[PDB]
Amino acid sequence: SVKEFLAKAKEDFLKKWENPAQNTAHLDQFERIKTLGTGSFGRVMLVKHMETGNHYAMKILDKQKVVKLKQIEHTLNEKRILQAVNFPFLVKLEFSFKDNSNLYMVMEYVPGGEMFSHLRRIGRFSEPHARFYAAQIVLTFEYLHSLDLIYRDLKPENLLIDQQGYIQVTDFGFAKRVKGRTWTLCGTPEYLAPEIILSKGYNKAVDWWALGVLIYEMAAGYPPFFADQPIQIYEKIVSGKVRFPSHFSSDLKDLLRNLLQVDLTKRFGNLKNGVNDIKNHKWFATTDWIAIYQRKVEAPFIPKFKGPGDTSNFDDYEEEEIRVSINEKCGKEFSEF
């Protein structure tokens, strides 16, 4: 059943993967309202689709800036993977298009805000709260990894909370479809596996490492390896001496010792049993895995929901007007977008 869900899912992903959707909207179909977040090449805005009156989250990327930083391949990956996937806890792409100056990805709007904001505000989540989120990630990485996708950027910043209090993963900008091995140093310092830092070649197991970081940070209030500068973070990660807060249950600590594990013959998620090594862990024993997938578990936290168009769960950012040039920029580099 788990095996034939993943086989249908792979067949659906692969037809979209080999023939991506292109040019399914235009900028003038949307009213731009407010910036929900930023990145290297631009921003994500709340928009309103004028024809239906539906709200969406539109990513706008400046093509010239992508080229200046040598990240063309990353942004093609983001859109090609997003358009192809389908899972309850992945933010859904509704449309995508490009013009002379920019690339656009219109996603569902997830109004509860970033896990990061609620975590920093609250301080830390209880084990049951953290577990509820962790399960959704476990099931998401099961799906993505079955498609030969590595995510490579798990962190509370990239986990949105939706109106029922469930997770939607965003930010596929570092995601990559790979059988075998890959080498780029990428991700967030605090979330990186040792093998990434040491330029060893790595695979999907880095995402399971990242999950250990996230669980640790959700439950502690702070990450297992931190310092003011990235180079000192790396140094703490390669030593691999994790200190656990005294309030951590003995089961949590044991799970964490198996995810934050430098040795890839011992790291959960990677091994022969696979993801079952995680699902059947004792920390997860109260977890009804099928009920998480079906969204029948009641979330420990529903964010305030102030009607559509409301952004009170997001921080404020400086707005900047979209400029569209009359000449086509970087047409050939972005032709498949």
Binding site: L69, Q71, G173, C186, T188, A220, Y222, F226, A227, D228
Partner: peptide, 19 residues
């Protein structure tokens, strides 16, 4: 404490990924 050191650190805001 570890919590105090984290809260006094320069890394409690949004983290950027590296390339």
């Amino acid at each position: 404490t570890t919590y105090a050191d984290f809260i006094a650190s320069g890394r409690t805001g949004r983290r950027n990924a590296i390339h």
